[PDB]
């Protein structure tokens, strides 16, 4: 638990411009965000799942946030009204933001992206498979077996068993 010995990062290191978009603006345009920003998301989630340290790969988290900000600024430069209409139809379509309720504006958004950036929208389940990456960060350590030099010693299988000296050593026996 957090004491004075633990080295938390300073608040000036944590002062990063954040992706402050709503749920409809994150659900819409996600399939073009993931393909454009697959190099940093996989490395950051590998950092989060392998080390399980919140203080580690903070630069990777900053890279993910900056890459998402760069993609949304690129969308803001060219295709703004189409993305706004797509997010509006996605939020007003149903309770949960489901893509199947209106496909009419999704085609216009993909047409705008195909005409401007020449990007192809991926399939429906491209981002839910297993991702294989060539991470530059080395894996930390193999789980070594704990050494117990003084355990409870049993009788070994190779130990010879001569007959007992004067047998059972009971009363009147042997």
């Amino acid at each position: 638990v957090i004491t004075n010995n633990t080295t938390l990062p300073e608040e000036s290191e944590l002062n990063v411009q954040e992706l402050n978009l709503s749920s409809a603006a994150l659900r819409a345009g996600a399939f073009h965000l993931g393909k454009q920003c697959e190099q940093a998301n996989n490395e950051f989630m590998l950092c989060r799942q392998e080390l399980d340290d919140p203080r580690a790969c903070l630069a990777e988290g900053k890279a993910v946030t900056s890459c998402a900000l760069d993609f949304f600024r690129k969308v803001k430069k060219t295709c703004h009204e189409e993305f706004t209409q797509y997010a509006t139809c996605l939020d007003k379509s149903s309770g949960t933001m489901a893509f199947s309720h209106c496909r009419k504006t999704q085609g216009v958004f993909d047409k705008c992206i195909k005409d401007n950036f020449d990007w192809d929208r991926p399939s429906y389940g491209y981002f839910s498979r297993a991702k294989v990456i060539q991470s530059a960060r080395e894996a930390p350590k193999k789980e070594e077996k704990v050494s117990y030099p003084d355990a409870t010693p049993g009788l070994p299988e190779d130990y010879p068993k001569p007959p007992a000296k004067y047998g059972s050593r009971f009363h009147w026996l042997e």
């Binding site: 978009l21 803001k76 706004t84």
Partner: peptide
């Protein structure tokens, strides 16, 4: 929407 994003 996209108007929240500052210009950079």
């Amino acid at each position: 929407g996209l108007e929240q994003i500052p210009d950079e």
